[PDB]
C-alpha cells in the first residue's frame, strides 16, 4: 500500500489564504533562452571578459548564449547541478517578503 | 579553576592507586597477556560465542514450526559463569581459563588465579572486563574459560594453550616478587 | 538459491565488460597478470573497459579470472554507461574532460564516420573497425564503488554486500574451471 | 502597570532569532534545517531589523514564532529522535561484534512517512500542482545524475523511473502544448488541469559533478520531491483510471530501457495532441531520441529506432551532413522542423529545413516637459528619476532588438 491512498480526495480548501504566508511562486518563464538564438543576441568578444568578471549573483544571465548549428552538436550544460542546489538554498534561505510592484 | 568531584575522585584513585604499595596478591593483574597472544585468543574464542536471544528463539521456533508439520550434536560454547567457572575449577574439566583485570570488587577474583595454578589448569590475564563481556552477548563477565573444543580446533586449542604458557606462566612466573606500586 | 549455467565456448563474437574484482586480498599480481592488466588499462580499482572476447583472447582471460568479473552487457545499460559516464584525456593535456562535447568526438575522428557520443554507442553495440580506434581513445569509466566503507549503516550494508558476492562468486583456483559469467547488468545498477 | 522595557514586544516576540528558536527547539542545526525544507519555512524581513533585536544592528535571520511554535509538536521530531536512538543502538551492536543482531535490529526498523506532511503543506491538488514545478526540475536533473558515493544508486534509479512515470503520463494524456530547446536542457510544458507546469529536461550527456555542492541539503530536498511526485502521480493515474504502478516492460527493457518501456493502460482534442497523427517516423542514429520519442508519442505518432535491431515510415530525421540514401517514400526532417511544429501548434512546411540548409533561429512560445518637474518633492524627484533611469535599460533592449539584427543581415 506504499503511497497506494488518495489524500487528496475531493479537497477543496486552501492554505495561502493565511495572512503571513507567502505563496509558492514559480520561476518566470523562459524567453529567448534558445540554444540557436538570433545572431544579434551573441556576446562581442570584448563583453565576455566583462561578463566573466562580474561576481555572482549581480548577473541577469548566468551563461553566455552561443550559435550552434545543430541539436545534435549542442553541449551538455557545465552549470546546471550549480543553479538548482542554489534555487533550492533560495527556496528556503532566501528572506520572503511581500512586496507591491 | 574548577573539575567536577567525581572526576577529581576518580583522578586521584588512580594517583593513590599507583603510589601505594600493593601486596603479592594485588597487582598479579596488570602484567597481563601480550596483545598478540590475547588477539589470538580472542579470534579462538569468538567462534565459540554461546547462542544469543534472538538466534535460540529462532532456532526454537524453527523446531516448533517442523514439529507442528511433522538429533544434533552436543551444543558448544564457552563457559563465562563466574560461580559456573568456579564449579567447574577444582574439579579438573576446564581447559583455558581468563581473568580480566578490571573487576569492580577486587576480593571477588583475587583467588581464583591461584585457584587455576593450584588446580594446574592452564590460566590467563586479559586486559579489560568489557572485551570478554561482549564476546558472550553481555554487559561484562569478568572470566571466560573453554570446556569443549570442536576436533577442529583441538589442535588450535593446544597450541595456544602451550604459548600462552610460556607467555604468562613464565614470564610472570616471579609476580610474587617485590611488593608493586613502587613508583615515585 | 541461484543456479549455475555451464556453456561451452564458440567461434562467435562477443562483447564483455570487465570490472575489478579487487582480490584476493593479500595477493601482489604476478608479471603474468601485470602485463595482461596494464594490456587491458584495468590496473586502478572499478575500472571498466570494453573488449571483444575472441578465440585467440579467451585464453588470457584466466589469466585474471579472480581479479575480475566478465560479461554481457546489455545495450541498454552500455548507452546508459556511455551517455552517463566518459572522459577523454583531451588538450587544454592533463585535464580529464567528460565527454559534453559531440565536436571533439568530430575533431578527433573525424574520417571514421562518428560524429556524437551516440555513434560511439552503436560502435560499441554492433562490432566494426571504429571500436578499435574508440577503445584505447575512450578512457574507459572508473565506475561508482559501493557503499564506500565508513557508516553506522554502511559498514552493516558492506557486510551484507561481501557476503553475497563470496556467496554468488567464488574462486575454484583450478586450472579448467570454466569461466564464471554474471548478469553485468545489475552489477552496473549497483554500479551505477 | 509598572514601567515595561525598552523593547519587549512587538517585533520582538513574533519573530525568534535562528539561534534562538534553535536552542529552544533543543534540536541539532541539520535536523532544523530538514525540519524547516519538510515545511518549507523560510526567513522573513521584520519591518524594523533594530526594533525586532534589542537594539542590535548585527546581522540576523528572522523566523515566525507562530511557524517554529507549531513546528515543535510534530511527529517528523520524534521519528528523528527514534531513528538517532536506532542509529547508537546499531552502532553499539557493530562495535559489540553482534553482527546478526545488529542485522536482526536494522531489519525490523521502518522509516517515517512525510504523507501528512504533503496534506498540510498543499492541502489542496491544484496548489500541488503549482508547486511541483520545483519537483520536476530537480527529479529530472537527479535522473541523469550519475551514481557516486554522496548518492546511492537507488535513490537515482527511484527518480528515473519517477520521472518516467511522468513522461508516460504526459504522452498518454497528450496534455503538452508547448515546448522549447536550450543550451541549459530542453524545456517542457504540459496545461495540467490548466496550471501550465513547466519542467526543463536537461542533456543526456554526463552529467559533471562540483564537489562543492552539499548533497545533503539537495537529498533532503530530492527525498520530499520525490514522495510529492508519487502522491501526484497515484492522484492522476487515479482520476484518469490507470492502473498504478505501471508495470515495466523487461523485453523492452533490454534493447534500449528507454521511454517506450514501462507501458500503462486504462482500469486528440487539441491542436499539439493531433499534429502528426498517424504518422510514422525514423529517427536516425545521431539524433536523440530520449528527445524526440517523447515529442512524437504525446503527439500521438510512430517512431522507429535505429536500435530496434541492435519502409512503410512516412517521416525520417537525420542531422548528417549528407544523406547517403534518400528514399523517395520518406519525408526527411530536421528535429527544428518537429520543434517548430509543437510551438506553433500546426504543420508547418517541412520544405523549409530540409537537412544541411540553413537553421533559422528558434525562439521562446511565451524642456518641456523636465521645466514642470523642478518643484517636486524630494520622494517624488527620485522616484522619476528611478524610473526613469529604469526605462533607461528598456529603452535599450528595444533598440538592440533590430540594431543587431539589421546589422549583421546586411553581411
Known amino acids: 500500500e506504499n503511497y497506494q491512498y488518495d489524500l487528496w480526495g475531493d479537497s477543496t480548501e486552501t492554505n495561502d489564504h493565511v495572512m503571513h504566508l507567502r505563496a509558492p511562486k514559480l520561476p518566470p518563464p523562459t524567453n529567448e533562452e534558445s540554444y540557436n538564438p538570433p545572431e544579434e543576441y551573441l556576446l562581442s568578444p570584448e563583453e565576455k571578459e566583462a561578463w566573466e568578471n562580474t561576481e555572482y549573483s549581480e548577473r541577469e544571465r548566468n551563461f553566455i548564449p552561443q550559435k550552434y548549428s545543430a541539436l545534435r552538436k549542442v553541449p551538455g550544460y557545465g552549470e546546471s547541478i550549480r543553479e538548482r542546489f542554489e534555487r533550492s538554498l533560495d527556496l528556503y534561505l532566501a528572506p520572503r517578503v511581500r512586496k507591491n510592484k | 579553576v574548577k573539575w567536577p568531584e567525581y572526576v577529581r575522585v576518580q583522578r586521584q584513585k588512580k594517583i593513590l592507586s599507583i603510589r601505594l604499595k600493593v601486596p603479592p596478591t594485588i597487582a598479579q593483574f596488570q602484567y597481563t597477556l601480550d596483545r598478540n597472544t590475547a588477539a589470538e585468543t580472542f579470534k579462538l574464542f569468538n567462534k565459540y560465542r554461546p547462542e544469543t536471544a534472538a538466534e535460540k528463539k529462532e532456532r526454537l521456533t524453527k523446531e516448533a514450526a517442523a514439529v507442528a508439520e511433522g538429533a544434533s550434536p552436543k551444543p558448544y560454547a564457552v563457559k563465562y559463569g563466574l560461580n559456573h567457572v568456579v564449579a567447574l575449577i577444582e574439579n579438573k574439566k576446564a581447559k583455558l581459563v581468563l581473568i580480566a583485570n578490571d573487576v569492580d570488587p577486587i576480593e571477588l577474583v583475587v583467588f581464583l588465579p591461584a585457584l587455576c595454578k593450584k588446580m594446574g589448569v592452564p590460566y590467563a590475564i586479559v586486559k579489560g572486563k568489557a572485551r570478554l563481556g561482549t564476546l558472550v552477548n553481555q554487559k561484562t563477565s569478568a572470566v571466560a574459560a573453554l570446556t569443549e573444543v570442536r576436533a577442529e580446533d583441538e589442535a588450535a586449542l593446544a597450541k595456544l594453550v602451550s604459548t600462552i604458557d610460556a607467555n604468562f606462566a613464565d614470564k610472570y612466573d616471579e609476580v610474587k616478587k617485590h611488593w608493586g606500586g613502587g613508583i615515585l | 538459491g541461484l543456479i549455475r549455467e555451464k556453456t561451452t565456448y564458440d567461434g562467435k563474437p562477443a562483447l564483455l565488460f570487465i570490472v575489478r574484482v579487487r582480490g584476493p586480498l593479500a595477493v601482489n599480481i604476478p608479471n603474468k597478470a601485470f602485463k595482461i592488466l596494464s594490456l587491458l588499462r584495468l590496473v586502478e580499482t572499478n575500472t571498466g573497459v570494453f573488449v571483444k572476447l575472441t578465440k585467440n583472447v579467451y585464453p588470457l582471460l584466466k589469466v585474471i579470472a579472480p581479479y575480475v568479473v566478465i560479461g554481457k552487457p546489455s545495450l541498454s545499460s552500455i548507452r546508459s554507461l556511455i551517455q552517463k559516464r566518459g572522459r577523454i584525456i583531451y588538450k587544454g593535456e592533463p585535464h580529464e574532460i567528460v565527454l559534453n562535447d559531440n565536436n571533439i568526438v568530430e575533431e578527433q575522428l573525424g574520417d571514421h564516420g562518428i560524429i556524437c557520443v551516440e555513434d560511439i554507442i552503436h560502435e560499441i553495440a554492433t562490432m566494426g573497425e571504429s571500436f578499435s580506434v574508440c577503445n584505447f581513445f575512450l578512457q574507459p569509466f572508473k565506475l561508482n564503488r559501493e557503499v564506500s566503507g565508513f557508516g553506522s549503516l554502511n559498514r552493516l550494508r558492506k557486510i551484507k554486500q561481501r557476503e553475497a558476492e563470496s556467496r554468488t562468486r567464488q574462486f575454484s583456483n583450478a586450472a579448467t574451471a570454466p569461466v564464471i559469467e554474471v548478469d553485468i547488468d545489475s552489477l552496473l545498477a549497483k554500479l551505477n | ?411
Open chain 4, 1 to 411: 502597570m509598572r514601567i515595561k522595557k525598552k523593547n519587549t514586544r512587538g517585533n520582538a516576540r513574533n519573530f525568534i532569532t535562528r539561534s534562538q528558536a534553535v536552542r529552544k527547539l533543543q534540536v541539532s542545526l541539520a535536523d532544523f534545517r530538514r525540519l524547516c525544507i519538510f515545511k518549507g519555512i523560510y526567513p522573513r524581513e521584520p519591518r524594523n531589523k533594530k526594533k525586532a533585536n534589542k537594539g542590535s544592528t548585527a546581522p540576523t535571520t528572522f523566523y515566525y514564532a507562530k511557524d517554529i511554535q507549531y513546528l515543535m509538536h510534530e511527529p517528523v521530531l520524534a521519528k528523528f529522535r527514534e531513528h538517532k536512538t536506532f542509529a547508537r543502538k546499531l552502532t553499539r551492536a557493530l562495535g559489540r561484534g553482534e553482527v546478526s543482531s545488529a542485522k536482526r535490529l536494522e531489519e525490523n526498523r521502518d522509516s517515517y512517512t512525510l504523507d501528512h506532511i504533503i496534506k498540510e503543506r498543499y492541502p489542496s491538488f491544484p496548489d500541488a500542482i503549482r508547486d511541483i514545478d520545483d519537483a520536476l526540475n530537480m527529479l529530472f536533473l537527479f535522473s541523469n545524475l550519475p551514481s557516486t558515493n554522496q548518492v546511492s544508486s537507488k535513490i537515482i534509479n527511484d527518480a528515473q523511473k519517477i520521472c518516467n512515470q511522468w513522461l508516460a503520463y504526459v504522452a498518454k494524456e497528450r496534455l503538452v502544448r508547448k515546448v522549447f530547446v536550450s543550451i541549459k536542457g530542453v524545456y517542457y510544458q504540459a496545461n495540467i488541469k490548466g496550471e501550465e507546469v513547466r519542467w526543463l529536461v536537461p542533456f543526456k550527456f554526463p552529467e559533471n559533478i562540483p564537489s562543492d555542492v552539499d548533497f545533503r541539503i539537495m537529498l533532503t530536498f530530492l527525498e520530499f520531491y520525490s514522495t510529492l511526485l508519487h502522491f501526484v502521480l497515484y492522484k492522476l493515474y487515479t482520476d484518469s483510471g490507470l492502473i498504478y504502478p505501471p508495470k515495466l516492460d523487461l523485453k523492452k527493457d533490454k534493447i534500449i530501457s528507454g521511454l517506450s518501456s514501462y507501458i500503462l493502460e486504462s482500469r486528440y482534442d487539441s491542436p499539439v495532441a493531433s499534429l502528426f497523427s498517424a504518422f510514422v517516423f525514423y529517427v536516425s542514429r545521431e539524433v536523440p531520441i530520449d528527445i524526440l520519442e517523447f515529442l512524437i508519442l504525446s503527439c500521438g505518432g510512430n517512431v522507429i529506432s535505429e536500435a530496434a535491431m541492435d519502409s512503410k515510415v512516412t517521416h525520417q530525421i537525420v542531422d548528417r551532413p549528407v544523406l547517403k540514401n534518400k528514399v523517395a517514400g520518406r519525408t526527411y526532417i530536421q528535429p527544428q522542423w518537429i520543434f517548430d511544429c509543437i510551438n506553433k501548434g500546426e504543420l508547418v512546411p517541412a520544405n523549409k529545413y530540409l537537412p544541411g540548409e540553413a537553421l533559422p533561429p528558434h525562439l521562446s512560445p511565451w524642456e518641456e516637459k523636465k521645466l514642470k518637474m523642478i518643484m517636486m518633492s524630494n520622494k517624488q524627484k527620485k522616484l522619476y528619476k528611478k524610473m526613469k533611469y529604469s526605462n533607461a535599460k528598456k529603452e535599450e533592449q528595444a533598440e538592440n532588438l533590430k540594431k543587431k539584427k539589421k546589422q549583421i543581415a546586411k553581411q
